[PDB]
């Protein structure tokens, strides 16, 4: 439980750091890192106590860990310029992290509801809109 929480928080931090160093598609990569850092903030607060998670909370945390591992795999893949160029030429909307953003948003909704109801923690609605704007800003930076 404590080890699981530390692993997820470390994943989020490595994803943010890797997104910050990305040389291409900076708006989309920076948005992914910023969103991940914001999602792990209440998990950092829960970790700062040292309570026991229910099995429903453990299930939701493990699903969130799986979405973060997928995001880390995508950032690692896109650290190679050729993989970015290949993916974007094949993509329809030019949104680099479309699939993993959907998974992060869906798994986060279940997890935050359990943190609020079970651990008394005090949403990805604008995300698809922000994704299209960041993708356009990135496409424009590339087209100069
Ligand atoms: C390859 N093809 C790209 C890009 C890119 O960043 N963007 C935003 C695109 O729209 N396309 C089609 N890359 C990545 O490499 C950028 C050029 O580096 C020299």
Can you tell me the distance from the alpha carbon of 118 to that of 56, in angstroms, rounded to the nearest whole number?
10
* Ligand 1 atom closest to 94 (CA): 10
At which residue do the structure tokens 């453990």 appear? 58
Q: Whose CA is nearest to atom 10 of ligand 1?
A: 139
Q: How far is the CA of 133 from the centre of ligand 1 (A)?
A: 16
Query: What are the residue ranges spanned by the domains of the chain?
Result: 1-144
Distances (CA, A) of 67 to 62, 106, 108, 138, 142: 9, 10, 9, 24, 28
Method: X-ray
Mutation pick for ligand 1 pocket among 79, 88, 143 (CB with most ligand atoms within 8 Å): 88
Would you give the end-to-end CA distance of the chain in angstroms? Answer: 49
């Amino acid at each position: 439980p404590g080890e699981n929480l530390k692993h997820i928080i470390t994943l989020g931090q490595v994803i943010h750091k890797r997104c910050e160093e990305m040389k291409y598609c900076k708006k989309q990569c920076r948005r992914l890192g910023h969103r991940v850092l914001g999602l792990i903030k209440p998990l950092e607060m829960l970790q700062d106590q040292g309570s026991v998670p229910s099995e429903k909370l453990t299930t939701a945390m493990n699903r969130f860990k799986a979405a973060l591992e997928e995001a880390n795999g995508e950032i690692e893949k896109f650290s190679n310029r050729s993989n970015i160029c290949r993916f974007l030429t094949a993509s329809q909307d030019k949104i680099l992290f479309k699939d993993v953003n959907r998974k992060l948003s869906d798994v986060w909704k279940e997890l935050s509801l359990l943190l609020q109801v079970e651990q008394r923690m005090p949403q990805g609605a604008s995300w698809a809109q922000e994704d299209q704007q960041d993708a356009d800003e990135d496409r424009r930076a590339f087209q100069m």
